[PDB]
A paper describes a structure:
Spike (S) protein protrudes from the surface of the spherical virions and mediates virus entry into host cells. It consists of an ectodomain comprised of the S1 receptor-binding subunit and the S2 membrane fusion subunit, a transmembrane domain, and a short intracellular tail. The CTD directly engages the cellular receptor, human angiotensin-converting enzyme 2 (ACE2), and functions as the receptor-binding domain ([name]). Moreover, we captured an ensemble of cryo-EM structures of [name]-[name]-2 S trimer in complex with the Fab of [name] or 3C1 up to 3.8 Å resolution, revealing the [name]-triggered stepwise allosteric rearrangements of the S trimer to coordinate the binding of neutralizing antibodies targeting the [name]-[name]-2 [name], also providing structural basis for MAbs [name] and 3C1 as noncompeting antibody cocktail.
To investigate the molecular basis of [name]-mediated neutralization of [name]-[name]-2, we resolved four cryo-EM structures of the stabilized [name]-[name]-2 trimeric [name] in complex with [name] Fab in distinct conformational states, termed S-[name]-F1 (associated with one Fab), S-[name]-F2 (with two Fabs), and S-[name]-[name]/S-[name]-F3b (with three Fabs). Among these structures, S-[name]-[name] and S-[name]-F2 were better resolved to 3.8 and 4.3 Å resolution, respectively. Our S-[name]-[name] structure reveals that each of the three [name] binds with a [name] Fab, with two [name] in the up conformation (protomer 1 and 2), and the third [name] remaining down but can still engage with a [name] Fab (protomer 3). Surprisingly, our S-[name]-[name] structure suggested although [name]-3 is in the down configuration, it can still bind a [name] Fab with a slight 3.8° upward tilt of [name]-3 and a further 12.4° outward tilt of [name]-2 to coordinately accommodate the binding of the third Fab. Our structures show that [name] Fab is bound on the top of [name]. Inspection of the better resolved S-[name]-[name] structure revealed that the CDRH2 and CDRH3, together with all the three light chain complementarity-determining regions (CDRs) of [name] form contacts with the [name] domain, particularly the RBM region of the S protein, with the buried [name]–[name] interaction surface area ranging from ~1320 to 1369 Å2. Among these interactions with [name], [name] contributes more than the heavy chain does. Specifically, CDRL2 (residues 53–64), which touches the top “palm” of [name], contributes the most to the interaction, possibly forming contacts with six residues (Y453, L455, loop, and Y505) in RBM. In pathway one, the down [name]-3 with exposed epitope can now bind a Fab, forming S-[name]-[name] with each of the [name] (two up and one down) bound with a Fab. However, here for both Fabs, we observed a state (S-[name]-[name] or S-3C1-[name]) with [name]-3 in the down conformation, but can still associate with a Fab.
Author numbering:
A (entry chain A): 341 to 582
B (entry chain a): 1 to 214
C (entry chain C): 14 to 69, 78 to 247, 255 to 291
D (entry chain b): 1 to 218
Write the structure that this text describes.
Amino acid sequence: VFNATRFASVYAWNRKRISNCVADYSVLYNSASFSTFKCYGVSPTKLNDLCFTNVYADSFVIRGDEVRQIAPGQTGKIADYNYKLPDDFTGCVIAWNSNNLDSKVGGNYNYLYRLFRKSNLKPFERDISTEIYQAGSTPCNGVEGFNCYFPLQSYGFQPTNGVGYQPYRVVVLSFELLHAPATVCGPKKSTNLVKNKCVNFNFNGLTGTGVLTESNKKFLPFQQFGRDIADTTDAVRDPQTL
Amino acid sequence: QVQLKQSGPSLVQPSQSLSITCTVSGFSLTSYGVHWVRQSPGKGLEWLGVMWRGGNTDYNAAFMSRLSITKDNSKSQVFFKMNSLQTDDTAIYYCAKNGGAHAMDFWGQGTSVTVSSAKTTPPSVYPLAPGSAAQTNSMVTLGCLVKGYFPEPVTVTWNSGSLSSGVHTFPAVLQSDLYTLSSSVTVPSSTWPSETVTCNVAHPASSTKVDKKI
Amino acid sequence: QCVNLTTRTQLPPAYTNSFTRGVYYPDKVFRSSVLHSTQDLFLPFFSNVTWFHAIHRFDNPVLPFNDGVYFASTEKSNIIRGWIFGTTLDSKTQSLLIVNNATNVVIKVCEFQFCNDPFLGVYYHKNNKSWMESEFRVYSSANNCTFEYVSQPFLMDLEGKQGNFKNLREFVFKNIDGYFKIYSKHTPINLVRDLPQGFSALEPLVDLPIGINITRFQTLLALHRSSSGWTAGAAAYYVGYLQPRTFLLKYNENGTITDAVDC
Amino acid sequence: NIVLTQSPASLAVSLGQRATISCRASESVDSYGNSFLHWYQQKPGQPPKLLIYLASNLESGVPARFSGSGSRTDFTLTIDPVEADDAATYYCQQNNEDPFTFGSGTKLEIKRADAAPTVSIFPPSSEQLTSGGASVVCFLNNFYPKDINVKWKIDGSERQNGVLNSWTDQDSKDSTYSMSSTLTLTKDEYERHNSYTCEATHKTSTSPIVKSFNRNEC
């Protein structure tokens, strides 16, 4: 999604559903290859230690002056009619300048946006309908005429324009947690295994304190841990090394 | 890239008809609208009509039956049929891309349609050099006099458009069924009379090109 | 899509008696020479399990998934192709689809529009055989997917064998806080009758953190023919319902369950 | 004809100030949720271009100083800070009711320090006399304000019959005014008097900007 070939429009933002995987979030925070990094309700330093049911990477492009409208509970033409964020948005929004990638000779006019809609969209909603609306009862039904504006306006992304007009590839990282079990987690940074030393351990499922040492025992291919007769952990299998 | 310059008209007489062909570039003609206006004939800027995105046309109250738009998607050319043009209708016509809220995002250079009973006249360039007694300090001024031409406009350039910084293009003065346009440029002594200077001209109405070295 | 089999012969709901089947490792904890007492969803030993079979009769009914279901498959022709799990088996909500198309094991969770009579078909079983699948009447379409898993490529031998049943594939399916724990056990047999009276410990196969409510299920089966006049091969499967009873697990020195006791 | 009374007609705004251009309208309002109009800017050597659509949005190519608001009838454009690159006329196009007429046109002038025009004259060449006429040209440039009166004077008396003027508006980069004046003389009239004078009176320059030439300079 970060290195995608091209981003969609702001009214037809592509909802990239991601589930059943693990990936680092601070890798982008400490990348120094972004123009905007502002999370809402969660810090990027702690996001690695949080699990969620599913996440969405909403890809779209907007102008530099329009990035201010991408926020939870913020009004605007692209916030109310193209892509609204909820008041309880516990995700993160990121963006980066794409003037050297999305620009074209004389300006890229392929990107579009919904200038207005009859009603405001719900959070995490997109509308690709080209239906036009009139002021009075005069029916247009397709082509324009007699004050029935066309809602989808085109973007002007010139290669030599100011920073407020250059294209910015935005990626809204939404997070969701429901009764279903959490599938999207971050990486748990492991340490070097120390043997024959009384050291505290923190394995995949079990934790404790004791002397870590190998033996001649053989667990089954699926058995990850081991306990004695009294339900006390007596042996384990290292998650990294079999 | 985005340029809607016009062409086709040379000279119009009162109470006549003539079409204006506007070049299309920078957008798809089949999905974008095309507007048509004039250039401030007396009072402020006016509006003639518009061709919507592949539908019907709308026009002004006064130009409902007189002016008409015809969009040719095969040749990518928009024709603008005019009727009942009077001497007071002399103005420059422009084409523009239709926007979202019936806006005119981008524009074209257009063409000046002169409506008058007088007949056309080709240009006649003359050299404008300073006098032999003119005192200066290693600097000289030059010009090109397009006197006795009709109708407007006329493009004046310096060495096929080499000089653009110090060149000054003045408007044409209205004479008796004629026009007199003036141009000037400030250049150092190292460029003249040391080097040769050739002033070019282009009359879109008559398609005349008169070369004259100063 | 809309294909429903008409060659299905009507038979009563036969059943048998499982001796000690339906036992598995409730966790990944190694134990050596001890008897671990635990109360979880196990099959009661010496209980009854429904007898389904697929011959030239075809059993794929909508069966219940209240607490948990145990599968025991006696096959010699590899007729089983997967299982359908869901609440109502329709596109109204999400449903877990487990299927084997003879090349990859596809496990997905979408709004599958399951058919009333789903089945797979093997074409050209007579000459230039190649035992390839082309027909897949499991569902019409699928939207709003939340899980997707595809195993490594392989080549399944779907050749119809004669004589006794040679493959005993046993599985367990339960939902623990959304974590669908799937167990597996494959062992050879020489069986000419109903379910064998023996003992076999079922190891975990996969763990699918999906998080959906399953109340009904079905079983996929392959067919052979060289579209309702199809016939089945030679295979049989069983359905046993789990219950939360206490069981002992006799672990040997190597960590395998050699015996168990239904309390 | 929508009567879009754009007022004032022109303003002399200096560097680092705020410009105000009003636009009154009557027909009409309630398009979908607002009743705003479009704004434009026409340079004297380029056709206009769309700056602000619905009076609330920017456009690529110009800085963010262009903004504004408006009520159901009156609409205002706000250019803040104004610099020496806004020598152009602004219009107001109605989009809620047809016809899509424009405003009267408010021309913002770059209020810079005053300057006197240049001094230069072009005697006629021998080719001009060959054609029968004799056209002299007087080149005045880089002066401000535009208030200037160029008049010719033959050796006999002041000539105000064949006095021509070509008023060039304030260029975008060059924030000064320019004007080229000429005189219509014939071959016989050119050989009548000895010298011919290009007189001019600028508002700032108290002394007249005068430049003459002799007939022998050819």
